[model samples]
Structures are given as C-alpha cells and as structure tokens.
Target: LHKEPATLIKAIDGDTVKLMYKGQPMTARLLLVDTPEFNEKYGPEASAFTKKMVENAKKIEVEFDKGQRTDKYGRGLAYIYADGKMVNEALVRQGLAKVAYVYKGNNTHEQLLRKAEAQAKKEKLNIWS
Candidate 1:
C-alpha cells in the first residue's frame, strides 16, 4: 500500500500542490489537467482558488490513474480525489484549470475540459476578455 494520512498543505498552482506526508514535504502534480503557468493570465486567481478549495478539505484521497507517481521532475503525479470526486475534472469544469494531455490514451475528460474552456472563454474569465 502507498502512504497514508497525506496532508494537503496548499495548492501551488492550478494543478500542483504542497503536501506533507509522514513529516516529509512533497509536491503533488495533479494529473489530467495542465493549468496555465504561474505568470499566465488568470494564473494567480486559479492558484488562489485551488488553495481555497484545499484549505477546507479534509482527508485527502488519491486514486492513481495511468500515471500513478512522479513526473519528469520526480514530483508525485496523481489523480486527486476529495470527497469521492476527481479534483482535476472539477477544476476544469469550474474553469479554474485547463486540460493537459500529453499521452495518447484518448482521455475521457478531454471533451468536458473543452466545454469548460469554451464556457470560460464566453465568460471572459482570464485571457479571453
């Protein structure tokens, strides 16, 4: 089994976060979404929203998808589930993040993500304005 009782400290960006597990500080890369860069439009807002979401969440649960752990930078890559929901999809659905797909798995969430992006554009949340 993997580590238990992982602490979600804060969301670093839209898709990344800081965590403490067993007294170890670690970074978690949320899978299935690639948010804008920290300097991109609406980046800070997205980050702040993510942080706010995680701040009140308790008992963070992780479900490993195709890529269970670690990106090229050795950071933990996981599909985050809080309260039995996919956090990545939630972020995209809310227009707080974007879908980042680098593989050829025909990710099921892509269409929904596109819809979210379109809505965000229509609403002019970030750069679309």
Candidate 2:
C-alpha cells in the first residue's frame, strides 16, 4: 500500500472525491464501496452525506492499493481516511453504500467491509431501509 496526505477539495459523489496532494489536484475513487448514483434512489442523500464528511474532516489520507493505483478513468483507486476513520468502511457501515468491485489480493479491508455491510443491512439503515 502507498500512503499520502491530502486536502479534500470536493466530494464528486458518494464514492469519489477530489483532493490536493503535494500541490497538485487529483481525483480518487473510494475502494471497495459503491454508493448510489446521483440520479438513482437515495443517491442525493449519499452524496450529501459524503460531502458533509469530507467538509468536516480535519485531515484526509489516501492509501493506494498495491496492484492498480488508478482505474480506467484515471482516478486513483484508494481507501480514504478522513479524520483518522476509513471513509469507505464508514459509508458501508452507515448503509449509504455497499461493498463492490474488490480485487482479489489488493483488498486489505475486505472482511471488515463485508462485515460492516452485513451489519448495516441487519440494522436496515439509510439505503438499506
């Protein structure tokens, strides 16, 4: 895994964000989590929640997986840490997202995230409701 400190510029959606890293701007897709699209049901709410989280975060960190650093669109695929919490896991645990698109060996938090998704479903929170 590769780590970098970044300043959140904006949340593009529930699972993607723009950041300023080392004085350059970049976009990152949250690894292992997929929230609804903006036009889909609960989509706006998910995006709003992500925006709030990023906006309120005092610090942001990006951890890139070993195999593929970026997706086909050129956005960095990573696990985002917001104020010391894993934003990807938070999204799933909160029921705003579901675990998706995991790489075989690249996923470090696969089990944890799957467990969180199960808990969220059990609780029927947000989208799960």
Candidate 3:
C-alpha cells in the first residue's frame, strides 16, 4: 500500500472525504466499506460520525491499496487514518457501514473489515438492526 500524510478538509459523506494532499485538494473514497446514501436512512448519522472522526484530527494518513489507486470516478481509493486509528475500520466496527465493493486480493484490510462486519451484524447494531 502507498501511504501519505494528509489533512482532512471535509467529509463529503460517510465513505468519502476531501483532503489536502501535497498542497492540493483531493477526494478519497474509503476502501473496503460503503455506507448509506447521504439522503437515505442512517446516511446523515454516518456522515456525522465520519465528520467527527477526521475533521479535527491532529494527524491524518491515507493509504492506497496495491495496483488500483483511484476508482472510475477518479476519487482516490484509500484507507484513512485519523490519529493512528483506521477510520475505515471504525465505521464498520461501529455498525455505520458494511463491507462492500471489495476485491479479494486488492484490499489490504479485507479480513479485518469482514470480521468487523460480522461482529456488527451479530450485535445487530445500527445498520444491522
């Protein structure tokens, strides 16, 4: 995975964010997870959660999986870290997201995400409920 330091500028939605990378604005789509639409149920809640997670983070890091860097939409596909904690995993662990749009070998956090999703479902938290 390719790693870089970044500043989170905004949370576009639960799974997408705007960041300042190398002095330029960039969009990053969280890898291994997908949340509801911004207009759909639980969407706003997820977005709010994400906003709280990264908006004021002292340190933010972005990691891109091997091979694919950007999606077809040109948004950088990444695993975001806020203060050393993986934001992508946090979303799943909190039941705000589900593992989706992941390729077996292309995702570095596949196992962790899948396990989190399983636990979230078992607990029937938020989206799972």
Candidate 4:
C-alpha cells in the first residue's frame, strides 16, 4: 500500500519494465496481469501497446503491495501507474493481458483487474479471440 514516482527506462515487455527508482536502475514486474510472451501471437502488440502507454504518460509511478517490494526473481512486484490509471488493470481492460499471479497479500487490485478481464473476455478482444 505504498507508491512513489518513477521514470520508465524501458518497456521490457508487457509485464516487465526497466525503470529508475530511488536513484537506482531496477526491473519491475507488473502485478496481477500477464501478457503474451514475445514469441506468442499477440506478444509484439502487447509490448508495443505497453510501450506507447508508458512512453506517452506525463506521469508514472509504481505502487508496491503490502509487505511486498520485490519478487523472487528480484524484480519489483507492484502495480504501475501511467498518469493516474493502473497499467496492470488497463492492460487487461484493453485485452492485451489476463489476470494472473494471484497470491494472498498482493490482491490489492484483483477485483478491479478481474472486472477488466471480464469486459475484455466479453468483447473477444485480442487474446480472447
């Protein structure tokens, strides 16, 4: 339940990113959503879409889940915000990703992300098709 300003250095893919935080370069894994891998059919599009969002955002921030700052892989485990919208949820809402990686404490936006996924499923957008 904490967030701070960040600067996007690279959109590594749809789910992971490289950024500047606290004067250090760090990698972050977008919480609660999973996008297609680069080899998958929609992978490139998802990556591109994410790149566009982060690159164009006037403001960007990263929010950490309760008691979670980094995942096992050493990537920051958190929700990323572009402007004020949560990118993890937005990716699902746009049908570029699906809800994934559910654990006990990091369910901060699970309901919100799932609702977005449901709408995408209903619309048969991208991966749903």
The best candidate by TM-score is 4
Candidate 2 lDDT for residue 87: 89
Clash statistics: count for each candidate: 1, 0, 0, 0
Query: What is each predicted model's overall lDDT from 0 to 1?
Result: 0.69, 0.89, 0.89, 0.90
Residue 110 local lDDT, model 1: 59
Looking at model 1, residue 109 earns an lDDT score of 51
Candidate 4 clash pair list: none
Q: For model 3, what is the error of residue 105's alpha carbon versus the real structure, in angstroms, after optimal superposition? A: 3.9
Per-residue lDDT of model 3, residues 40-93, tens digit only: 877998999999999878999998888587889989888999998898999998
Mind giving the per-residue lDDT tens digits that candidate 4 earns over 39-97? 99889989998888899999889998886778888899889999988889888998999
- Root-mean-square deviation of each candidate, in angstroms? 3.5, 1.2, 1.2, 0.9
lDDT (Cα, tens digit) per residue for candidate 2, span 1-129:
656899998889999999997888889899998999989887998899888888999989999877787889989888999888888999999999999998886788889999999999999998889
Candidate 1 collision pairs: 70-77
User: What is candidate 4's CA lDDT for residue 4?
Assistant: 94
Taking the tens digit of each residue's C-alpha lDDT, what string does model 1 give over 1-129? 232456787778778888875688778887667777779877887787677777767777655444335667978766666655666767776677766754555254557567777787688765556
State how far residue 54 of model 4 sits from its true place (Å).
0.5
Score every model by TM-score: 0.73, 0.94, 0.94, 0.96
Q: Is candidate 1 or candidate 2 better by lDDT?
A: 2
For candidate 1, report its TM-score: 0.73
| Cα lDDT, model 1, residue 15 | 84
